[PDB]
């Protein structure tokens, strides 16, 4: 059909600045009896359906201000936001509706960039009476670092931990700015009595280490 | 400065196999003996209804359009890292094309990469026909500086292109690392007819219009006549302006009052 | 200021073979196209079919081919999309839009969209999560702001709450997305800030209600013995 | 799009099977010109043109080789040596609306009539009178084009037919688009009937010991008949003569 290349994906600009997402596809999505170009940009923020922004890539619709902006012809396209605001930590998209199969962008999951931050780590043993579920959960918390572009890593005695130490991160945390992390190991007791020592660390941009706040088993 | 084109611009219009023949043939030919312009580098010269191009790798390729001004589809013709490249897009070429010739390269319909084609006399027929480009060539060795060499050579189709463009003017190139030589002439609808020789090969040609002599092979069929008086063709002088005599009515009879009628 | 009220939803084992419908208002239904758009968890928009005003052309999805059909029932101001042999990838709130005939054809882009449900694609139990607690007694020794939290292990499906002493915290409360168990199993943990000084100076309870199963369990978070 | 501005694709290099396009009712009208509908998987063309465009159903006569008329002389002209077909069909549902479908338009108030095959995407407003009318449209001052309302309820003549007219390149330049058939093997030194990508005869075939250049795919003889040919998959050169006569 008509596969399109939306780009850049993952924008982390700063307040106020001007920012651009093109948008190219195979085909030459327009039409000349109505030089109009059959293609639309949307928004959304998350928990919410997106947004109509620009129809015919590139008029204002209303309820838009000139934070943005669609333009583009032949295949390539163009959303300009001019000025960014504290709303506009959202994800945008382009679509196509020339023809049939309709198809949508990649995304653009748009951030105010902030300054890089501090990450914060915390440790947990598995809780004393949770042993019965057959489930020893060994937790690390994290908060205010970013950019996400960090390494966060468990070691159970100098073995890399995969599948059994999984991890979960929320979006740009309003308070910070910045990103927030919790990675748990998931061990068996028969798994939980043939080691030593539980560690969890993150290394960061500020950081040239990882640091590691570790436990020796029994305390 | 021109030159004279003594038998050259002669190509196979139909690509159908002929031998041992002579074949009679109306299509967009350069006469014989028909002076050509030569350029030593060029101003917008038109490609008002076909070209005939010689030249003698120092020369790189051709712009052919009608304003050249990203308002028209405009051909190109170059050559890179031994590769031939044609585009059709909407250029805004530079006024003095040398690799900038290629600026503005937006809105394109087609583009093409191929082998290349190239002292020596390059000889090329370019013609649009039926929305359609075609260029015929041939490459021979050359030893003239200030001619157009004497002598004889059919040049086969090379290439045809789906164009369909409104085709007025053109230009030729030289590329960055006064000029060469080259030669241009304007085919017009004539006819001729042709020797094809037994390998299929063209070999002779006459235009039965150059001459009278030329006129009597054309309706003997032949190249060679015999002592005679032959019946050719007739002459008729041709009138010399239109004229229009009509009545001096000037009422406008009244249609509405047919047309516009309320109860018929 | 069109409402749109999605019937069916909920979860669904694969090879079953279901449908939904969704109740318009505020508008002509019966001169409008519609479309189903998923908005997968993570992944973002994705378009499913479309239906003419008059329901007259159905048009599907490359990768929904021998999977959904899509009717309209006018009538009701409803449009009804069976669902047959889901897969586990399925999982997505399917948001029904309704169309804006300007484009010179009968499709066009869309503006109005309405709150699909969040039909469930998984071949398991519906298990409630236990709560856990998160207090580690003696690794919380950063002074003045230590994360201690709650976990919510074995949650399924996703909706949950988690509010810290009955909201009584407020900074520093993260809500994480799903962990999920390699086993596909729904886990996520929850933790507030606390001045190791006052650890005990606030029992605090971790309530968990598990919309799915209304699993209405609470657990204590407290410096322990450890 | 639209008679304002036929959409032209160049389409080669296919095996088309017209039985699928001839066997469908979906068509209203389906007329063949310089062809036989029933004799399309036989032939080989060596390009295919397909124009498409949206028109009334009054004008689908038009759409003919003379038959001049408004569309016919201003918007879309067929030449009168016209070797192809035209599909027509009433597309009601697709390109009317309750609201009306407006944003197909078409052409008036041209200087002239057109070229076969010739495009024309100029809007310039027109000049009734002397006037010199730069960008202003009073009394003598007319915007070329105009649009249609295509709404359901109208009247067959005025609802929206989507047309699409295919012209074949006969012309015996190596051949592309060829129906379905169905390859043999060549048999030499026997007088047997042949079909070679279109070209039909009857005679006895042999190797020749004549160089084509590489661009002729066949040669013809002082009546128009071929006496060699090119084999495809080969690329060989064949002679023909007549597999033998004579008086009794
Ligand atoms: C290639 O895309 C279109 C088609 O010509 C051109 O975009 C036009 O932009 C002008 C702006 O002055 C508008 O007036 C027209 O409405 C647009 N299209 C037309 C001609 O209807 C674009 O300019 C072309 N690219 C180049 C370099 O010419
Ligand atoms: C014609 O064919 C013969 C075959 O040997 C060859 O010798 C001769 O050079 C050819 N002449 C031309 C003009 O091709
Ligand atoms: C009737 O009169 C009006 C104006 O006088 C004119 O526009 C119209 O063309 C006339 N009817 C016919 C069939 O000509
Ligand atoms: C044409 O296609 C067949 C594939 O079966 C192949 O065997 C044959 O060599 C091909 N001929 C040419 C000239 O490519």
């Known amino acids: ?219 | 400065a021109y030159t004279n084109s003594f038998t050259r611009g002669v190509y196979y219009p139909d690509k159908v196999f002929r031998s041992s023949v002579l074949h009679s043939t109306q299509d967009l030919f350069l006469p014989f003996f028909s002076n050509v312009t030569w350029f030593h580098d060029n101003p917008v010269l038109p490609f008002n209804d076909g070209v005939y191009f010689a030249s003698t790798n120092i020369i790189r390729g051709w712009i052919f359009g009608t304003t050249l001004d990203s308002k028209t589809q405009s051909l190109l013709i170059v050559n890179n890292a031994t590769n031939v490249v044609i585009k059709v897009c909407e250029f805004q070429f530079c006024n003095d094309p040398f690799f900038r010739v290629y600026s503005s390269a937006n809105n394109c319909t087609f583009e093409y990469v191929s082998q290349p084609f190239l002292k020596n006399l390059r000889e090329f027929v370019f013609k649009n026909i039926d929305g359609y480009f075609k260029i015929y060539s041939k490459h021979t060795p050359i030893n003239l500086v200030r001619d157009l060499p004497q002598g004889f050579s059919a040049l086969e189709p090379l290439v045809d292109l789906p164009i369909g463009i409104n085709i007025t003017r053109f230009q030729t190139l030289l590329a960055l690392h006064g000029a060469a030589a080259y030669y241009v002439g304007y085919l017009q609808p004539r006819t001729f007819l042709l020797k094809y020789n037994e390998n299929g090969t063209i070999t002779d040609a006459v235009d039965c219009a150059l001459d009278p002599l030329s006129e009597t092979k054309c309706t003997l069929k032949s190249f060679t006549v015999e002592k005679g008086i032959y019946q050719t063709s007739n002459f008729r002088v041709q009138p010399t302006e239109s004229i229009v005599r009509f009545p001096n009515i000037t009422n406008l009879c009244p249609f509405g009052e047919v047309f516009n009628a309320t109860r018929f | 200021e069109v409402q749109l009220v999605e019937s069916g939803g909920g979860v669904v084992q694969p090879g079953r073979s279901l449908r939904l419908s969704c109740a318009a208002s505020g508008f002509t239904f019966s001169s409008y196209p519609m479309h189903w758009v998923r908005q997968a968890p993570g992944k973002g928009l994705e378009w499913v079919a479309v239906i003419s005003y008059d329901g007259s052309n159905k048009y599907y999805a490359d990768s929904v081919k021998g999977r959904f059909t899509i009717s309209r029932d006018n009538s009701k101001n409803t449009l009804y999309l069976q669902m047959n042999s889901l897969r586990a990838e399925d999982t997505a709130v399917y948001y029904c839009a309704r169309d804006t005939e300007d484009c010179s054809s009968t499709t066009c882009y869309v503006d109005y969209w309405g709150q699909g449900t969040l039909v469930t694609v998984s071949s398991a139990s519906t298990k409630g999560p236990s709560v856990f607690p998160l207090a580690p007694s003696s690794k919380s020794t950063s002074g003045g702001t230590a994360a201690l939290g709650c976990l919510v292990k074995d949650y399924f499906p996703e909706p949950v709450t988690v509010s810290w002493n009955s909201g009584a915290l407020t900074s520093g409360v993260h809500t994480f997305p799903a962990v999920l168990q390699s086993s596909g199993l729904y886990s996520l943990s929850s933790v507030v800030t606390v001045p190791s000084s006052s650890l005990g100076t606030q029992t605090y309870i971790c309530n968990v209600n598990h919309k799915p199963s209304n699993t209405k369990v609470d657990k204590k978070v407290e410096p322990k013995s450890c | 799009a639209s008679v304002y501005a036929w959409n032209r694709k160049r389409i080669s290099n296919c095996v088309a099977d017209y039985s699928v396009l001839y066997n469908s009712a979906s068509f209203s009208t389906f007329k063949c010109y310089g062809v036989s509908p029933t004799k399309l998987n036989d032939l080989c063309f060596t390009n295919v043109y397909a124009d498409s465009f949206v028109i009334r159903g009054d004008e689908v006569r038009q759409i003919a080789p003379g038959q001049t008329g408004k569309i016919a002389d201003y918007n879309y002209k067929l030449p009168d040596d016209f070797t192809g077909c035209v599909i027509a069909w009433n597309s009601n549902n697709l390109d009317s609306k309750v609201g009306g479908n407006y944003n197909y338009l078409y052409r008036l108030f041209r200087k002239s009539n057109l070229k076969p095959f010739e495009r024309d995407i100029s809007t310039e407003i027109y000049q009734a009178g002397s006037t010199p009318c730069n960008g202003v449209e009073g009394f003598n001052c007319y915007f070329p084009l105009q649009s249609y309302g295509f709404q359901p309820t109208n009247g067959v003549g005025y609802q929206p037919y989507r047309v699409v007219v295919l012209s074949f390149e006969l012309l015996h330049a190596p051949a592309t688009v060829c129906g379905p058939k169905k390859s043999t093997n060549l048999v030499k030194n026997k007088c047997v009937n042949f079909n070679f990508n279109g070209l039909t005869g009857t005679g006895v075939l042999t190797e020749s010991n004549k160089k084509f250049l590489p661009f002729q795919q066949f040669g013809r003889d002082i009546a128009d008949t071929t006496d060699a040919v090119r084999d495809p998959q080969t690329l060989e050169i064949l002679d023909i003569t007549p597999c033998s006569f004579g008086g009794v």
């Open chain 1, 1 to 219: 059909d008509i596969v399109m290349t939306q780009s850049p994906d993952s924008l982390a600009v700063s307040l106020g600045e001007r920012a651009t997402i093109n948008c190219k596809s195979s085909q030459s999505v327009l039409y000349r009896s109505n030089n109009k170009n059959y293609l639309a940009w949307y928004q959304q923020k998350p928990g919410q359906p997106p947004k109509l922004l620009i129809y015919w890539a590139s008029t204002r619709e209303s309820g838009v201000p000139d934070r943005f902006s669609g333009s583009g012809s032949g295949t390539d396209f163009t959303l300009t936001i001019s000025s960014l605001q504290a709303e506009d930590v959202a994800v945008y998209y382009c679509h196509q509706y020339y023809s049939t199969p309709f198809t949508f962008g990649g995304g653009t999951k748009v951030d105010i960039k902030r300054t890089v931050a501090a990450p914060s780590v915390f440790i947990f043993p598995p809780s004393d009476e949770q042993l019965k579920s057959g489930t020893a959960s060994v937790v690390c918390l994290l908060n205010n670092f970013y950019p996400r572009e960090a390494k966060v890593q468990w070691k159970v005695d100098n073995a890399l931990q995969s599948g059994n130490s999984q991890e979960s991160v929320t979006e740009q945390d309003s308070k910070d700015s910045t990103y927030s992390l919790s990675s748990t190991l998931t061990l068996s007791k028969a798994d939980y009595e043939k080691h030593k020592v539980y560690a969890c660390e993150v290394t960061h941009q500020g950081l040239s280490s990882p640091v590691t706040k570790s436990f020796n088993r029994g305390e």
